[PDB]
C-alpha cells in the first residue's frame, strides 16, 4: 500500500504510537518494507530519543543494518539483549545475523584483544544449527577455544557433513590459508569429535599431522575394539613416522594385551602381504631383462644394469645371471652392485642372510662393505647385523670399516633418538675421514634417526657437528651434506626458534650460509606464511647461486598441496640452475598434461647436468606414454651420463620424510661417481 | 544408427581403452575409420566424434582452410601433425568437412604424405585418424586401398525416419510446442539435409530471439519459418 497513512507515524514522539507502530513494523518486516527502506533520512533524527526502547533498538538496527554501516549496526543488538524456521526468522536471523554478527565478530575480534560477543556467537551458533546450512556459518565463524565448544556443541547427529565438508574444506583451507596455531585446535577438537565418531583413519591423519603418541594407543585399543586389519596395519605403518612407531613399540611392547600389534606393528608385515601377492597378481615378461639388460655396456650402463638388478621389480633372472658381472664392475659400482642384492631382497629376511652371506667378509673391501649396506637395505627391524659391522668400525684413518660405516651407518639409518648409535657416531664424526660420504651418511643417518622430533632439538649432537663442521674449512661438499642432516634434525618442528638460533650461531662467510639457508629451507616445511614467499621473491635475486638452488628448491616442499600455483616462470629465467629448480619442483606427482608440457621444453637442453637432470623427474613423474619420451631421448643423443640416466629413467618408470630426504640429498649429483655409489641406495622409491 | 555408432565406438575405442582384448588379440588396426554422410554438416559426425571424447584426447581440425589461406607451404603442417601425433598419441585425429580438393597437384602429394606417413612407417602404428567429409566420391582413390583397411561406414537415406529422428535431436535442446507436428515437416520437405533443418532451427531460435521470447506459437513458427524460408 501507499506510505500516506503509515509514513507520518514516525513524526510523533508519543510512547503508545511507538509501542503499536513498531509491532506493525514487525508484521510488515517480513520483507523489510515496500521498498529499500528510504525512511532513514526522516527517522535518523530519532536517535537521541529514549518504555519499549529495545523495540526502537530493533527498528534502528533493522534499518541501519538494512542500508549501510560497519560498526553502528550491532550496537543496538549488544544493547538490546535479543528477546521477544520462518521467512522473517531467516531474514533477521540468517542473513542479518550472519552479516551483522560476522562484522561484529570481525570488528571486535580485530579491535579488542567480552562475553557479549560470546553469548551472541553461541546464540547464532544454535540458530544456524537450526538453519542446518553448513560450511557457511562455519566458514564465517572460523575466525572467532571458541571453535572447540562450537564443534563439540554442534556435532550431535551429522557426521559426514561436518566431518567430510567441514574437515575437508577447513582442513585444506586451514593448511593453505589459515595460520598454524589454529590447526592445533583443528587437530585437538577434531581428535575429540573424531574420537566420538567412527572411521578411525581420519583420526589417523590427525596422527599424521599431530604426531602424537596417545592417539595411536587410543586408535589401537579402538581399532582392537573393532575387528581390514592387516591393511590398516600397512597404511598405519606408512602413515606413522620414526618416533611414534618406536614409542608405539615400547608401550605396546610393554602391554598391547594381544601380542598381535607387536607381531604386526614393528617389522615383516608391511612386506609380508605385498611380495607374495606381487609375484602372484603381477606378471612381468623377460624382454626387459634381455632388452633393457642388453643395451648396457661401457661399464657405466653396467652400473645402469646394477640399477636394472636392484630396481627392476616377479622374475629374478638378472639376479642369478651367472657370475663375473660384478667382477667386470668398478669399485663404487661394486658398492652399488653389492647393494643391488640388498634392493632385490626387501623381503625374505631368512633368505637375505643366506644370499648376502656369500658376499660377506669376502676378499674385496667394496664387496663386504656394500654387503653390509645390503644388510641395512633389506630390512629395518632385524638389528642383528649391527654387531659384525659395529665391532669392526674403528679405523681412525682410512680402513675398510669406514666404508662399512658408509653402508652400515647409512643402512642402519634406514633401519632406524637412539642413545647408543650416536655415541658410536661420536668417533665417526670425530674421525673426519677424507671420504665425503662418511659425514654424508653420518649426518643423513642421524637425521633420519632424528626426523619427526618434538619441535626439534639444539642438542650437542648437531651442535657438535656444527662446531666440528666449521672446524675444517675444506671440501665444501661437507658444508653441503652436513646441513642436510642438520635440517633433517630440524624436521618435526611446529614452533621451533631454531631458525633464529642458527641465525645466531651458524652464520659466517658463504661457507656456512648454505647451512643457514638449509635451516631456512627445512625450518619452513609449509603453512600459510606468504611473508616467506615474498622473502623468497626478494632473496631469490641473491648473487650466490646455491642458496638460489636450495632456497628456491624449497618450493616443492612448501606448496606441495596447492599444486595449481606451483607452475611458475622459473623456466623462463636465465641463471644457471633455475630451470633445474622447477624441474625438481615437478617431482613425482601424478604428472598431468601441463607437467609433461613443461617437460617438452625441459627435455631439450644442451648442458649435460640439465639433460642429465631431466629424465630423473621425467620418470619419477610417470611411474603407451612411459617409453615414448625415452625414445625422444634416443633422438636427443642418438653423453654417458645422459644414457645411464635415461636407462635409469626406464627403470625409474618401471609429508613423509622417507620420500623427501633421498632426493634432497640427491640434489648434489654433479660430482664424481663416488656420490653415485650413494645414488643407488635411495629409499624414496616405493 | 545405434549399430553404426557402436561399430565406430568398438572400432576406434578398442585401442588404449579396454586393452585386455586389443593387445592380447594381435590385431592393431592403427588407421581409424572414414566418415561421410549425405546430411553432413558435422552434426551427426560431431555426435559420433563426441562419443569418443569421454576418455581420450580430442583434436578437431575442420577443413583445409588453414592451409589454403597462405602461400603453398605444403605438407609441413602435416609433418607437424606426424611429430605431435608421434610424440603425443592419445589424441584421435578428427578432420571434419574435408574440402581440400574442392594447387590441386600438391594436395595429391600431401595426400600421399598423410597416406604414407599415417601408416606408421617407423613404429607399430602410432595414431588413429578419423576422417569426416561431405562427399566420398570426390576423394582420390589413393586413400582407399592403402589407407582404409579396417572399416568405412555409409549413412543410409531415410527419407522419413531419421529425418524425424534428426528433428528430434535438433529439437531436443530446444522447446517445441504441442501443436507443432512432425509429419507435415518431414513430409513437406523434399530432399533436405541436416543443414536445412538446422537452418529452420536457426530461424526458430533466432526469430524467437527477434521478439525476445522463449516460446514459439504455431503462427510464429510459420512466420519464423519465413525467415530462413526467405533467406535460403
From Swiss-Prot, chain A:
Under the cellular component aspect of Gene Ontology, which terms does the record hold? cytosol; extracellular exosome; extracellular region; ficolin-1-rich granule lumen; membrane; nucleoplasm; nucleus; proteasome accessory complex
User: Composition bias, kind Basic and acidic residues: at what positions?
Assistant: 19-47, 547-567
Q: Does the keyword Phosphoprotein apply?
A: yes
Q: Which UniProt keywords apply?
A: Acetylation, Phosphoprotein, Proteasome, Repeat
What does the record say about tissue specificity?
Found in skeletal muscle, liver, heart, brain, kidney, pancreas, lung and placenta.
Under the heading Pfam families, the entry gives: PC_rep (PF01851), RPN1_C (PF18051), RPN1_RPN2_N (PF17781)
Biological process terms in GO annotation: proteasome-mediated ubiquitin-dependent protein catabolic process; regulation of protein catabolic process
Q: Where is this region: Disordered?
A: 1-47, 547-569
* Biased composition range(s): Low complexity: 5-16
Assembly and partners are described as: Component of the 19S proteasome regulatory particle complex. The 26S proteasome consists of a 20S core particle (CP) and two 19S regulatory subunits (RP). The regulatory particle is made of a lid composed of 9 subunits, a base containing 6 ATPases and few additional components including PSMD2. Interacts with RPGRIP1L. Interacts with CRY1 in a KDM8-dependent manner.
Q: What does this protein do?
A: Component of the 26S proteasome, a multiprotein complex involved in the ATP-dependent degradation of ubiquitinated proteins. This complex plays a key role in the maintenance of protein homeostasis by removing misfolded or damaged proteins, which could impair cellular functions, and by removing proteins whose functions are no longer required. Therefore, the proteasome participates in numerous cellular processes, including cell cycle progression, apoptosis, or DNA damage repair.
**Protein name according to UniProt:** 26S proteasome non-ATPase regulatory subunit 2
Protein species of origin = Homo sapiens
> Which gene is this protein's source?
PSMD2
Swiss-Prot record, chain B:
Q: In which compartments does the protein localize?
A: Cytoplasm; Nucleus; Membrane
Q: How does it sit in the membrane?
A: Lipid-anchor
Q: Which residues in this protein are found as N6-acetyllysine?
A: 69
The covalently linked position for Glycyl lysine isopeptide (Lys-Gly) (interchain with G-Cter in ubiquitin), per the record, is 48
Q: Which residues bind ATP?
A: 37-44
* Keyword Phosphoprotein belongs to the record: yes
What main location does UniProt list?
A: cytoplasm
Name a single GO biological process.
proteasome-mediated ubiquitin-dependent protein catabolic process
| Cellular component aspect of the GO annotation | cytosol; membrane; nucleoplasm; nucleus; proteasome accessory complex; proteasome complex; proteasome regulatory particle, base subcomplex
Gene Ontology molecular function, alphabetical: ATP binding; ATP hydrolysis activity; proteasome-activating activity; RNA binding
- Keywords, A to Z? Acetylation, ATP-binding, Cytoplasm, Deafness, Intellectual disability, Isopeptide bond, Lipoprotein, Membrane, Myristate, Nucleotide-binding, Nucleus, Phosphoprotein, Proteasome, Ubl conjugation
Q: What does this protein do?
A: Component of the 26S proteasome, a multiprotein complex involved in the ATP-dependent degradation of ubiquitinated proteins. This complex plays a key role in the maintenance of protein homeostasis by removing misfolded or damaged proteins, which could impair cellular functions, and by removing proteins whose functions are no longer required. Therefore, the proteasome participates in numerous cellular processes, including cell cycle progression, apoptosis, or DNA damage repair.
Record text on subunit structure and interactions: Component of the 19S proteasome regulatory particle complex. The 26S proteasome consists of a 20S core particle (CP) and two 19S regulatory subunits (RP). The regulatory particle is made of a lid composed of 9 subunits, a base containing 6 ATPases including PSMC1 and few additional components. Interacts with SCA7. Interacts with NGLY1. Interacts with PAAF1.
Which disease is this protein implicated in?
Answer: Birk-Aharoni syndrome: An autosomal recessive disorder characterized by failure to thrive, severe developmental delay, intellectual disability, spastic tetraplegia with central hypotonia, chorea, hearing loss, micropenis and undescended testes, as well as mild elevation of liver enzymes.
**Protein family (similarity comment):** Belongs to the AAA ATPase family.
What is the protein's name according to its record? 26S proteasome regulatory subunit 4
- Biological source species: Homo sapiens
Name of the gene this protein is made from? PSMC1
Amino acid at each position: 500500500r501507499d506510505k500516506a497513512p503509515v509514513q507520518p507515524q514516525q513524526s510523533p514522539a508519543a510512547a503508545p504510537g511507538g509501542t503499536d507502530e513498531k509491532p506493525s513494523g514487525k508484521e510488515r518486516r517480513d520483507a523489510g518494507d515496500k521498498d529499500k527502506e528510504q525512511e532513514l533520512s526522516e527517522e535518523d533524527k530519532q536517535l537521541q530519543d529514549e518504555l519499549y526502547r529495545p523495540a526502537l533498538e530493533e527498528l534502528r538496527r533493522q534499518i541501519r543494518s538494512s542500508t549501510t554501516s560497519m560498526t553502528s549496526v550491532p550496537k543496538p543488538l549488544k544493547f538490546l539483549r535479543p528477546h521477544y524456521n520462518k521467512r522473517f526468522a531467516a531474514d533477521i536471523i540468517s542473513v542479518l545475523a550472519m552479516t551483522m554478527s560476522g562484522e561484529r565478530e570481525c570488528l571486535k575480534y580485530r579491535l579488542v584483544g567480552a562475553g557479549e560477543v560470546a553469548k551472541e556467537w553461541q546464540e547464532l551458533d544454535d540458530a544456524e544449527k537450526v538453519q542446518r546450512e553448513p560450511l557457511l556459518t562455519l566458514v564465517k565463524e572460523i575466525v572467532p577455544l571458541l571453535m572447540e565448544i562450537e564443534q563439540v556443541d554442534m556435532l550431535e547427529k551429522d557426521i559426514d557433513e561436518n566431518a567430510y565438508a567441514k574437515v575437508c574444506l577447513y582442513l585444506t583451507s586451514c593448511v593453505n590459508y589459515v595460520p598454524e596455531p589454529e590447526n592445533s585446535a583443528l587437530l585437538r577438537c577434531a581428535l575429540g569429535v573424531f574420537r566420538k565418531f567412527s572411521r578411525f583413519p581420519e583420526a589417523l591423519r590427525l596422527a599424521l599431522m599431530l604426531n602424537d603418541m596417545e592417539l595411536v594407543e587410543d586408535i589401537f585399543t579402538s581399532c582392537k575394539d573393532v575387528v581390514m586389519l592387516g591393511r590398516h596395519g600397512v597404511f598405519l605403518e606408512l602413515s606413522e613416522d620414526v618416533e611414534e612407531y618406536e614409542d608405539l613399540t615400547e608401550i605396546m611392547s610393554n602391554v598391547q594385551l594381544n601380542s598381535n600389534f607387536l607381531a604386526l606393528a614393528r617389522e615383516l608385515d608391511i612386506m609380508e602381504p605385498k611380495v607374495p601377492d606381487d609375484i602372484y597378481k603381477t606378471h612381468l615378461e623377460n624382454n626387459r631383462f634381455g632388452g633393457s639388460g642388453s643395451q648396457v655396456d661401457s661399464a657405466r650402463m653396467n652400473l645402469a644394469s646394477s640399477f636394472v638388478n636392484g630396481f627392476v621389480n616377479q622374475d629374478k633372472l638378472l639376479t642369478d645371471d651367472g657370475n663375473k658381472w660384478l667382477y667386470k664392475n668398478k669399485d663404487h659400482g661394486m658398492l652399488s652392485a653389492a647393494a643391488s642384492l640388498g634392493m632385490i631382497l626387501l623381503w625374505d629376511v631368512d633368505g637375505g642372510l643366506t644370499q648376502i652371506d656369500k658376499y660377506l667378509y669376502s676378499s674385496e673391501d667394496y664387496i663386504k662393505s656394500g654387503a653390509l649396506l645390503a644388510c641395512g637395505i633389506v630390512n629395518s627391524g632385524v638389528r642383528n647385523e649391527c654387531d659384525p659391522a659395529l665391532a669392526l668400525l674403528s679405523d681412525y684413518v682410512l680402513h675398510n670399516s669406514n666404508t662399512m660405516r658408509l653402508g652400515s651407518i647409512f643402512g642402519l639409518g634406514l633401519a632406524y633418538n637412539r642413545e647408543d648409535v650416536l655415541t658410536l657416531l661420536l668417533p665417526v664424526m670425530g674421525d673426519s675421514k677424507s671420504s665425503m660420504e662418511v659425514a654424508g651418511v653420518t649426518a643423513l643417518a642421524c637425521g633420519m634417526i632424528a626426523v619427526g622430533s618434538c619441535n626439534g632439538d639444539v642438542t650437542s649432537t648437531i651442535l657438535q657437528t656444527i662446531m666440528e663442521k666449521s672446524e675444517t674449512e675444506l671440501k665444501d661438499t661437507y658444508a653441503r651434506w652436513l646441513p642436510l642432516g642438520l635440517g633433517l634434525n630440524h624436521l618435526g618442528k611446529g614452533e621451533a626458534i631454531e631458525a633464529i638460533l642458527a641465525a645466531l650461531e651458524v652464520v659466517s662467510e658463504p661457507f656456512r650460509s648454505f647451512a643457514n639457508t638449509l635451516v631456512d629451507v627445512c625450518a619452513y616445511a609449509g603453512s600459510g606464511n606468504v611473508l616467506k614467499v615474498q622473502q623468497l621473491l626478494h632473496i631469490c635475486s641473491e648473487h650466490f647461486d646455491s642458496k638460489e638452488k636450495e632456497e628456491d628448491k624449497d618450493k616443492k616442499e612448501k606448496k606441495d598441496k596447492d599444486k595449481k600455483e606451483a607452475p611458475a616462470d622459473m623456466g623462463a629465467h636465465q641463471g644457471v640452475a633455475v630451470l633445474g629448480i622447477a624441474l625438481i619442483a615437478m617431482g613425482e606427482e601424478i604428472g598431468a598434461e601441463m607437467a609433461l608440457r613443461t617437460f617438452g621444453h625441459l627435455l631439450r637442453y644442451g648442458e649435460p647436468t640439465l639433460r642429465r637432470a631431466v629424465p630423473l623427474a621425467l620418470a619419477l613423474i610417470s611411474v603407451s606414454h612411459d617409453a615414448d619420451p625415452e625414445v625422444s631421448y634416443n633422438s636427443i643423443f642418438a653423453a654417458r651420463l645422459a644414457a645411464m640416466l635415461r636407462q635409469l629413467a626406464q627403470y625409474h618408470a618401471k609429508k613423509g620424510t622417507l620420500t623427501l630426504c633421498p632426493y634432497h640429498s640427491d640434489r648434489q649429483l654433479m660430482s664424481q661417481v663416488a656420490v653415485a655409489g650413494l645414488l643407488t641406495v635411495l629409499v624414496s622409491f616405493l | 544408427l545405434d549399430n553404426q555408432i557402436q561399430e565406430i565406438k568398438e572400432s576406434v575405442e578398442l585401442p588404449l581403452t579396454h586393452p585386455e582384448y586389443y593387445e592380447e588379440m594381435g590385431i592393431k588396426p592403427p588407421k581409424g575409420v572414414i566418415l561421410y554422410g549425405p546430411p553432413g554438416t558435422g552434426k551427426t559426425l560431431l555426435a559420433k566424434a563426441v562419443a569418443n571424447q569421454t576418455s581420450a584426447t580430442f583434436l578437431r581440425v575442420v577443413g583445409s582452410e588453414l592451409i589454403q589461406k597462405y602461400l603453398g607451404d605444403g605438407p609441413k603442417l602435416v609433418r607437424e601433425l606426424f611429430r605431435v601425433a608421434e610424440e603425443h598419441a592419445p589424441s584421435i585425429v578428427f578432420i571434419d568437412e574435408i574440402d581440400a580438393i574442392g594447387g590441386e597437384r600438391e594436395i595429391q602429394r600431401t595426400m600421399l604424405e598423410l597416406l604414407n606417413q599415417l601408416d606408421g612407417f617407423d613404429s607399430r602404428g602410432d595414431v588413429k585418424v578419423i576422417m569426416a567429409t561431405n562427399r566420398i566420391e570426390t576423394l582420390d582413390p589413393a586413400l582407399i586401398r592403402p589407407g582404409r583397411i579396417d572399416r568405412k561406414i555409409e549413412f543410409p537415406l531415410p527419407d522419413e525416419k531419421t529425418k524425424k529422428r534428426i528433428f528430434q535431436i535438433h529439437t531436443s535442446r530446444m522447446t517445441l510446442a504441442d501443436d507443432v507436428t512432425l509429419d507435415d515437416l518431414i513430409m513437406a520437405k523434399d530432399d533436405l539435409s541436416g543443414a536445412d533443418i538446422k537452418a529452420i532451427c536457426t530461424e526458430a531460435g533466432l526469430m524467437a530471439l527477434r521478439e525476445r521470447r522463449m516460446k514459439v506459437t504455431n503462427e510464429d513458427f510459420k512466420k519464423s519459418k519465413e525467415n530462413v524460408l526467405y533467406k535460403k
